[PDB]
Write a protein that binds this ligand. Structure first.
Ligand SMILES: Cc1cn([C@H]2C[C@H](OP(=O)(O)O)[C@@H](COP(=O)(O)O)O2)c(=O)[nH]c1=O
Ligand SMILES: [Ca+2]
Length: 129
């Protein structure tokens, strides 16, 4: 997989963000995670976490997996990196997302994220409290 540039246009919620990619505004949905909806328990915390991580980044990058690059709603499907740190992984590691939506052919980082989830759960963090 390859990291490619993007710039933040606007935070949306814990697992979606609006980024400019190849010069075009897109909504991106983070691969392999599910955050609570803003209206649900830990939803606001997840949104806040993602918003900060993107806003504080000097450099945002997107990394497509091997399969589908856009979902049925037109959202880009990617692993997102803030100054080299994968946002998807960081959410799961903090107990603010569950590993989810693991489709065959877009699951390169599954094990990495499952390891994060196990550590969050052992720590009883957030969703695992
Ligand atoms: C993360 C992800 C979501 N989706 C679709 C499945 C879900 O369909 P449904 O909308 O029919 O439930 C939806 C979940 O996204 P959200 O968690 O953003 O709602 O997005 C994909 O198709 N591929 C993906 O990799
Ligand atoms: Ca969600």
């Amino acid at each position: 997989l390859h990291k490619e540039p993007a710039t933040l246009i606007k935070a949306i919620d814990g697992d979606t963000v609006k980024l400019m990619y190849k010069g075009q505004p897109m909504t991106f949905r983070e691969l392999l995670v599910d955050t609570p909806e803003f209206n649900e328990k830990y939803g606001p915390e997840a949104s806040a976490f993602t918003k900060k991580m993107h806003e504080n980044a000097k450099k945002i990058e997107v990394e497509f997996d091997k399969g589908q690059r856009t979902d049925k709603y037109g959202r880009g499907l990617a692993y997102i990196y803030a100054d080299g740190k994968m946002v998807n992984e960081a959410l799961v590691r903090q107990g603010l997302a569950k590993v989810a939506y693991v489709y065959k052919g877009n699951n390169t980082h599954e094990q990495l994220l499952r390891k994060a989830e196990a550590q969050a759960k052992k720590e009883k963090l957030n969703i695992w409290s």
